[PDB]
Design a binder for this molecule. Structure first.
Ligand SMILES: NS(=O)(=O)c1ccc(CCNC(=S)Nc2ccc(-c3c4ccc(=O)cc-4oc4cc(O)ccc34)c(C(=O)O)c2)cc1
Ligand SMILES: [Zn+2]
Length: 257
């Protein structure tokens, strides 16, 4: 099916997922000079103290650290959000080289990778119902640059060898996502979509301005993963990012002056 290769990559997705050419697609380039500070934005609240991680899975597109979202444990509120959004999973998008990998870009700058913490609006009951709503999801995006190692990320890095191929999963309990956040919560926000098929336009994007630093060694291990399943020709899981899409009259708002 769809992927990131030359024959099934982003430029081909529209054939099976027409919304790919929609009016609210993600990611987008964030032109910092055009983004406007929005006084109406309420304080952003990231409450991950009771987060319950459960498993890590290689789904053939990236790897997901899944959480128990049967209760209001890890939640995201405030900012441009109305109500409570529950953390369900987080994953990354990265490149084959340090100069690329992020999905959103800042003044056209591409980061080495991008972390996506996915949350769904609790007023819709479940994730399935949420992806049928214009405000069903909220994804917190964090940029990764290559520099000093990120202590909180190492546990994720060290388990990757156990889920090298598509379909493989491993227990991943007691992981604290707070160790992946930068110091500042300054952010840019705009209405968008999922960046991979089905590309549904149900996401309120909140992209943090401050990137986190990860070591070359850490990202190199991300690049050892496989898109393929076990026993198949090895296709390194790299460059699993979608390029910037047309803004289409949308406005990106800044939480800071
Ligand atoms: N990069 S990004 O933008 O951050 C991003 C990209 C992709 C995705 C996820 C893409 N895949 C989707 S959407 N998967 C999906 C959607 C709905 C359901 C779903 C479906 C679907 C059809 C239906 O008829 C009833 C469903 O009921 C459901 C009840 C639930 O409690 C949770 C999910 C769920 C399920 C599933 O079955 O696990 C998976 C997340 C973030
Ligand atoms: Zn993503």
């Amino acid at each position: 099916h769809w992927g990131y290769g030359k024959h099934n990559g982003p430029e081909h997705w529209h054939k099976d997922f027409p919304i790919a050419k929609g009016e609210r697609q993600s990611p987008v380039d964030i032109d910092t000079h055009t983004a406007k500070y929005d006084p109406s934005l309420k304080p952003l609240s990231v409450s991950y103290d009771q987060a319950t991680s459960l498993r890590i899975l290689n789904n053939g597109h990236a790897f997901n650290v899944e959480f128990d979202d049967s209760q209001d444990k890890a939640v995201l509120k405030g900012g441009p959000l109305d109500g409570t959004y529950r953390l369900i999973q987080f994953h990354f998008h990265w490149g084959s080289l340090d100069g690329q990998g992020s999905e959103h870009t800042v003044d056209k700058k591409k980061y080495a990778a991008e972390l996506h913490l996915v949350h769904w609006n609790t007023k819709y009951g479940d994730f399935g119902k949420a992806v049928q709503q214009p405000d069903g999801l909220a994804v917190l995006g964090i940029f990764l640059k290559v520099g000093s190692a990120k202590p909180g990320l190492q546990k994720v890095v060290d388990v990757l060898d156990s889920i090298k191929t598509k379909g493989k999963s491993a227990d991943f309990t007691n992981f604290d996502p707070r160790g992946l956040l930068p110091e500042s919560l300054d952010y840019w926000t705009y209405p968008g979509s999922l960046t991979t098929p089905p590309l549904l336009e149900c996401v309120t994007w909140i992209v943090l301005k401050e990137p986190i630093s990860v070591s070359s060694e850490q990202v190199l291990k991300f690049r050892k993963l496989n898109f393929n399943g076990e026993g198949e020709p090895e296709e390194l899981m790299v460059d699993n990012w979608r390029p910037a899409q047309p803004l289409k009259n949308r406005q990106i708002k800044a939480s800071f002056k």
